[PDB]
Amino acid sequence: ADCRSTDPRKSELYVVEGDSAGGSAKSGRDSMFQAILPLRGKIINVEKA
Amino acid sequence: IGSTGERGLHHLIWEVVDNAVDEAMAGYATTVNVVLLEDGGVEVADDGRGIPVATHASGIPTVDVVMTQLGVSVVNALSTRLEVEIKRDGYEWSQVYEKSEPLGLKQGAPTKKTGSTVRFWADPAVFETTEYDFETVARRLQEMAFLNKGLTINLTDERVTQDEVVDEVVSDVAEAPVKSRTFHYPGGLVDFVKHINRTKNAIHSSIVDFSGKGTGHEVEIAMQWNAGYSESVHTFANTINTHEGGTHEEGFRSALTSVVNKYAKDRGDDIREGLAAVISVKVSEPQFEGQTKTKLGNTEVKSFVQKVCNEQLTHWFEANPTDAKVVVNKAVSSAQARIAARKSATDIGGLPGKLADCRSTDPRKSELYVVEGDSAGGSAKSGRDSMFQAILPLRGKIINVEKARIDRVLKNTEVQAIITALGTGIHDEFDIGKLRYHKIVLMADADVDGQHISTLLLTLLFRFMRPLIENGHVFLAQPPLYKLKWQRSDPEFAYSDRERDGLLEAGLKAGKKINKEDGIQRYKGLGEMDAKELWETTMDPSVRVLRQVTLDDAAAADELFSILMGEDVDARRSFITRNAKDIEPVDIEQEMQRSYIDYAMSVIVGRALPEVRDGLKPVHRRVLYAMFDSGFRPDRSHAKSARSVAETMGNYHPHGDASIYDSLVRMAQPWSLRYPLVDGQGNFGSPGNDPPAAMRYTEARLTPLAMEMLREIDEETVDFIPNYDGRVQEPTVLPSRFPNLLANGSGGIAVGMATNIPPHNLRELADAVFWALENHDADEEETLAAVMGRVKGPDFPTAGLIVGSQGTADAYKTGRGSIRMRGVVEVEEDSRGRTSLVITELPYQVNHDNFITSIAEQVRDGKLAGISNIEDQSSDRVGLRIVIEIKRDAVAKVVINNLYKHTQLQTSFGANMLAIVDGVPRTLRLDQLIRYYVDHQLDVIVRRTTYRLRKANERAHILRGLVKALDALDEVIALIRASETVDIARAGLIELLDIDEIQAQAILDMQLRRLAALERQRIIDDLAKIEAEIADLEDILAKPERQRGIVRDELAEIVDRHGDDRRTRIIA
Amino acid sequence: TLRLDQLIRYYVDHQLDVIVRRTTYRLRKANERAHILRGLVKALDALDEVIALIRASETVDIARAGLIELLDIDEIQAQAILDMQLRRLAALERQRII
Amino acid sequence: FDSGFRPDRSHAKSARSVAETMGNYHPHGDASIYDSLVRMAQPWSLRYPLVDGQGNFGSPGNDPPAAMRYTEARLTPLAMEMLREIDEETVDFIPNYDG
Amino acid sequence: VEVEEDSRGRTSLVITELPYQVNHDNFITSIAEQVRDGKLAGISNIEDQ
Ligand SMILES: Nc1ncnc2c1ncn2[C@@H]1O[C@H](COP(=O)(O)OP(=O)(O)NP(=O)(O)O)[C@@H](O)[C@H]1O
Ligand SMILES: [Mg+2]
């Protein structure tokens, strides 16, 4: 859910999980400089991987 | 007669009709009129010769002689009244029989015209039911006209309710600006095979027809071969369906095989594989053997039919060789396909651990019980008597064998399992000798699942295992209907509705105690019953009642199964819409019909269609009510979603939280409902691919609009019915003080039929309701004109645009129309001259995240061009912002146009005005939806006024009772103190003051705080307060036009505080 | 990870705690119910005057504070009397309270 | 216990006992709850069963129990001793999922 | 395990009890497969009575 702002200085990335606060973080945000990455699946354990 | 139930009750009709038709079969009667009467009788009129009226050999008229002997005599025997009108010998007669008593034949008017008429009323003191199945009757008469090439049969049903769908072809549209059917088939058996191969879709075009005159008989055969996978070879011996077989069948088969071998020299089950044929024999002295009274014995008929078939069959192949060629290219295909089918080390093979077989080696004393795994799997396996009972629990899904090829049938595990248990083969490999259990007891629930399974198995046994039914090895468990649960005594089990009252009264009268709300248990599932209960009530031979599945007409049963289980959706749809207001030998065609309708409707009402009155399916209704009754009103603070889900799950809808929360959420989502019924808190997803948060996290409560949906439900404004565990009462419909169906819309597909109603504006809808309220006495044609105009079209929450107004006017005037929807795109240039189209509005039901991707993948595969980027800049603060970057070479106007072309940015909404009107699925016009809602609202008001009057004359009685005690307080208090017990004090009150046991208990249960001066005056003033209300509601009842007004004003108020400005703009 | 004795003793210990926690609460409740019955029994002796008082006061709050002026008791004890249903003033039921 | 399903009183459908747990104590999917309910009802599972069931409660084989709408279940004389005087502040209490 | 017989003359071993937590139907299965695979010989038949 990318923000308007092109400049990374003023940009902001919010990493959620769609199941938790995806739908709502997407609504609440100042879309001018805020982007939402709702994690919609199972993340792996990258330790001994 | 055969049965005291429905099976035997119909046999009377056949015993009457069969005489009238075998008169037409003599060639004297042209038309037979069959009338199912409103009361309970049956009228069978005809234009035959006339029943012999004059005095017989005995001395009493021949009409009376035929009515009390061998036949039709049994009709009069089992009749409370049987009238016989005869038109013969230049005059017409009366002859009436009162409870089988031949009273007298009065000769009136001189009729030079011939015929007869029999009107008989069945005895309810003898039969369980006196209600005849129209479809059962309808089907058997249809074949009666097929067998006789020049006869008309006219069936009419009188007891048809004012509204109900009567039509054979139920119109997919409009339906607006006595069930009758006529049978006449000039083709004969030719017309019959056309009817058979209608759906089967035949290879060749030439129907084989030939007639064989006999030395004491007469045969007629019609044939056609199909693409289909089975033999539809229906046989008849004197209008009787010889389903078992007989010499005419085995003579035609000999002569048919000895004909297909002569034409194989040119260029068994094998041949027959395709064929749909009809053998119609006439035998002078026919005698039938068989386990059923069917199966023609007559050995000379074999030699006659084989001689007729030999000569006439070869002849067709000689004269029509071009079709004869495509016949053998199906027959030899059948051979090599089932040849290849044919074709392990130290194996038991006997169903590993998916069955629990009986100790008994002998099949004669052995019983197999086919149960559903989760239904009676464990309880049957344990309750049983292992010495002779086996349990095959079906742990899986059963295929709809009806149209499928024997390949997919035998693959399906649950089908494959059954065959392995019985031991007998399949079609060719089938040998009844190998039968391992001499009783097959199918046990399944009354629930929508159990009925769905019964249909599936009765389809299978009828097709792939017909001998098992005929020989009478297939049964149906008859489990208890009720469990009368006494407090001190052990429970008694009732199987009948009548039997319950029996044990209920007698038991109470004998001095027993039962709860008078939840005291009786109506079973729905076998899962309910304990192991012990299961043996004592439905498994033990010493107590049980079984139901023997008997086939009574295979040709009519072929029809029933080809409709409900077949591939013809429009025939099936129609049947459902017609039949919507719905030890012992049982008919297959009637169990199969009841089980189908019950399942068909449960899946229709439950998930497919909204009610016309309140627009909801039961789940939403049950969420809203559990919420209301739990007190999650808008005044009070939100409750965790889980709480509402739990309250619905535990009391009204006991199926997994899954669907319950899924509906709760939809009613909360402002992009889902035009007028949201739920007021949510937290993450309730997005119009993209974002789900809502867990039920444990989100919170919801009713909206003040949903409060109008519920408004005064507690005041007996709707009919309540007992919930799944008959512990509480659940409403059949919600009051709906605003028109929910049209206001919010409705979608849904289930069992062939689907609905798709759009959402509308409440303000525009109130206008049309006020018009209907006011202009209460106006024509369907005028009121439809008025509703359109007030209502200017659908008003989607997601807003957008409605392009044109034909599909809009279509769906209003018919009930089916296509509504074009478009999205609002704005254009904004950058800073570096880079233009970009920004989607601000998208049509209703288009998924946001699924849309962006569509464009992305369309651009990726070249189908979309001039697009360099897509961004979702949408938030709650800046609405929808799907930002499409367009190239500097590309023209923004054409890109906007190409998106309107390919993508979801433009999509037409297909409207379907389907709704459950009086339990009947119905396609409706805008005015009908309006007038049915006003109907509801006017009922709601009188009912509300009724309860209010009752619940006031109730209170006033008490208050008058209390006031009486306040003035007599010194006496009242000095009395109570002197009396030793409460009941002694209560008796003294009824003495002292002329009051009721209820007015006196009001005094006793009265707290001391209520005696302080202000509170006495509170009771004094309350009585005169309530007495003023009583005066009013008496008037409200008295004046119906005053109630019409209440509706208007109460609804204006709702649109004056909750109505809103039109979201989507209608354009052209 | 525990031996058999570790499990037996941790059990016994919890039962011994369950008893004291109960007895403490039972006693805590027994004195609560006692002061109430003490309140009502006191009111049963003055019953004539008690009844005379309640009806002589317009509101329940004048009657409540009047029920502490009359009988030397507390607001919880005075609310126990006011909420007393008339039925509880028949001979057998008055004897149940005493 | 809180819902009053003592062994004195008649059997309540499993769905009522399930809905209550899910309602204000454990707000998850009914399967996890009902599965626990069913275990305490099975005499081949618990040596001393805590649930007095009624209906198809599966088998020690591959037979599942019936739907929660069908089976009925209540507490056991022994499970009553497990809850013996919980109302009497014999144990510590904590606030539930919503509080 | 009890060992009944003298019916037709043929002997059989009837399992009257099984250790705690063995799935009955997965056990009958287990035996039957071993028998099909030859791994368990002598067993001519298995059934839940
Ligand atoms: N419309 C009719 N006109 C003249 N005679 C009739 C008519 N309908 C019935 N009958 C006569 O009524 C008689 C009595 O009926 P019934 O006892 O059923 O004998 P049946 O028809 O020979 N045998 P069944 O095969 O059992 O119907 C018949 O034998 C006919 O002769
Ligand atoms: Mg007859």
Side-chain angles (χ1 to χ4, degrees), chain B residues 886-898:
Chain B
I886 49 99
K887 294 173 198 161
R888 267 135 120 174
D889 54 85
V891 168
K893 221 63 257 157
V894 67
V895 180
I896 268 151
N897 183 17
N898 271 299

mmCIF file of all heavy atoms in Angstrom, chain B residues 886-898:
data_model
loop_
_atom_site.group_PDB
_atom_site.id
_atom_site.type_symbol
_atom_site.label_atom_id
_atom_site.label_comp_id
_atom_site.label_asym_id
_atom_site.label_seq_id
_atom_site.Cartn_x
_atom_site.Cartn_y
_atom_site.Cartn_z
ATOM 1 N N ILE B 886 0.376 7.212 -16.266
ATOM 2 C CA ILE B 886 0.269 7.108 -17.716
ATOM 3 C C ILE B 886 1.478 7.733 -18.377
ATOM 4 O O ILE B 886 2.011 8.741 -17.901
ATOM 5 C CB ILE B 886 -1.067 7.601 -18.317
ATOM 6 C CG1 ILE B 886 -1.489 8.983 -17.791
ATOM 7 C CG2 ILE B 886 -2.150 6.565 -18.118
ATOM 8 C CD1 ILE B 886 -1.155 10.099 -18.717
ATOM 9 N N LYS B 887 1.922 7.101 -19.462
ATOM 10 C CA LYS B 887 3.083 7.511 -20.236
ATOM 11 C C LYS B 887 2.863 8.884 -20.893
ATOM 12 O O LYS B 887 1.715 9.280 -21.135
ATOM 13 C CB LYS B 887 3.427 6.446 -21.292
ATOM 14 C CG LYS B 887 3.899 5.102 -20.734
ATOM 15 C CD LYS B 887 4.043 4.095 -21.871
ATOM 16 C CE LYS B 887 4.077 2.668 -21.399
ATOM 17 N NZ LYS B 887 3.752 1.730 -22.504
ATOM 18 N N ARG B 888 3.971 9.612 -21.168
ATOM 19 C CA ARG B 888 3.923 10.929 -21.803
ATOM 20 C C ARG B 888 3.523 10.833 -23.286
ATOM 21 O O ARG B 888 2.965 11.788 -23.832
ATOM 22 C CB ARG B 888 5.224 11.707 -21.575
ATOM 23 C CG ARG B 888 5.148 12.606 -20.334
ATOM 24 C CD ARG B 888 6.392 12.528 -19.467
ATOM 25 N NE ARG B 888 7.066 13.823 -19.307
ATOM 26 C CZ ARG B 888 8.113 14.046 -18.512
ATOM 27 N NH1 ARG B 888 8.616 13.064 -17.773
ATOM 28 N NH2 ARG B 888 8.661 15.251 -18.449
ATOM 29 N N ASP B 889 3.743 9.651 -23.905
ATOM 30 C CA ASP B 889 3.363 9.329 -25.288
ATOM 31 C C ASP B 889 1.868 8.966 -25.371
ATOM 32 O O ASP B 889 1.208 9.321 -26.351
ATOM 33 C CB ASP B 889 4.231 8.178 -25.845
ATOM 34 C CG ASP B 889 4.251 6.916 -24.990
ATOM 35 O OD1 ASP B 889 3.334 6.073 -25.148
ATOM 36 O OD2 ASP B 889 5.182 6.773 -24.165
ATOM 37 N N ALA B 890 1.353 8.264 -24.328
ATOM 38 C CA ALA B 890 -0.025 7.784 -24.171
ATOM 39 C C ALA B 890 -1.023 8.907 -23.866
ATOM 40 O O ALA B 890 -0.708 9.840 -23.117
ATOM 41 C CB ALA B 890 -0.084 6.722 -23.082
ATOM 42 N N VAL B 891 -2.229 8.799 -24.460
ATOM 43 C CA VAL B 891 -3.342 9.738 -24.303
ATOM 44 C C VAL B 891 -4.222 9.277 -23.131
ATOM 45 O O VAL B 891 -4.884 8.235 -23.224
ATOM 46 C CB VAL B 891 -4.136 9.871 -25.628
ATOM 47 C CG1 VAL B 891 -5.467 10.597 -25.426
ATOM 48 C CG2 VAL B 891 -3.295 10.562 -26.696
ATOM 49 N N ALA B 892 -4.232 10.055 -22.029
ATOM 50 C CA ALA B 892 -5.000 9.750 -20.810
ATOM 51 C C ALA B 892 -6.458 9.375 -21.083
ATOM 52 O O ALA B 892 -6.978 8.453 -20.452
ATOM 53 C CB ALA B 892 -4.934 10.921 -19.843
ATOM 54 N N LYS B 893 -7.096 10.062 -22.058
ATOM 55 C CA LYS B 893 -8.485 9.826 -22.444
ATOM 56 C C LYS B 893 -8.734 8.410 -22.962
ATOM 57 O O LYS B 893 -9.698 7.772 -22.515
ATOM 58 C CB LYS B 893 -8.987 10.894 -23.436
ATOM 59 C CG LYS B 893 -10.427 11.369 -23.173
ATOM 60 C CD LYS B 893 -10.613 12.078 -21.797
ATOM 61 C CE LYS B 893 -11.269 11.211 -20.733
ATOM 62 N NZ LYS B 893 -10.937 11.681 -19.363
ATOM 63 N N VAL B 894 -7.843 7.896 -23.847
ATOM 64 C CA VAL B 894 -7.986 6.544 -24.399
ATOM 65 C C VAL B 894 -7.679 5.454 -23.334
ATOM 66 O O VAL B 894 -8.310 4.397 -23.362
ATOM 67 C CB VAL B 894 -7.219 6.331 -25.738
ATOM 68 C CG1 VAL B 894 -5.704 6.397 -25.572
ATOM 69 C CG2 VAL B 894 -7.655 5.040 -26.445
ATOM 70 N N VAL B 895 -6.738 5.725 -22.399
ATOM 71 C CA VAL B 895 -6.353 4.783 -21.337
ATOM 72 C C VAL B 895 -7.536 4.584 -20.386
ATOM 73 O O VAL B 895 -7.880 3.447 -20.065
ATOM 74 C CB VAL B 895 -5.037 5.211 -20.633
ATOM 75 C CG1 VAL B 895 -4.642 4.226 -19.543
ATOM 76 C CG2 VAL B 895 -3.906 5.337 -21.644
ATOM 77 N N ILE B 896 -8.204 5.695 -20.024
ATOM 78 C CA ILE B 896 -9.403 5.738 -19.187
ATOM 79 C C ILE B 896 -10.465 4.892 -19.879
ATOM 80 O O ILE B 896 -11.126 4.083 -19.236
ATOM 81 C CB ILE B 896 -9.809 7.233 -18.990
ATOM 82 C CG1 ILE B 896 -9.158 7.808 -17.714
ATOM 83 C CG2 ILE B 896 -11.329 7.469 -19.007
ATOM 84 C CD1 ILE B 896 -8.876 9.297 -17.752
ATOM 85 N N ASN B 897 -10.552 5.031 -21.207
ATOM 86 C CA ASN B 897 -11.474 4.301 -22.060
ATOM 87 C C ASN B 897 -11.120 2.802 -22.143
ATOM 88 O O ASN B 897 -12.035 1.982 -22.104
ATOM 89 C CB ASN B 897 -11.516 4.955 -23.443
ATOM 90 C CG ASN B 897 -12.480 4.361 -24.443
ATOM 91 O OD1 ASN B 897 -13.413 3.614 -24.104
ATOM 92 N ND2 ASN B 897 -12.292 4.732 -25.709
ATOM 93 N N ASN B 898 -9.810 2.444 -22.244
ATOM 94 C CA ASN B 898 -9.363 1.042 -22.330
ATOM 95 C C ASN B 898 -9.541 0.312 -20.998
ATOM 96 O O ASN B 898 -9.807 -0.893 -20.992
ATOM 97 C CB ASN B 898 -7.943 0.897 -22.902
ATOM 98 C CG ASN B 898 -7.906 0.770 -24.420
ATOM 99 O OD1 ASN B 898 -8.464 -0.164 -25.032
ATOM 100 N ND2 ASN B 898 -7.241 1.708 -25.069
#
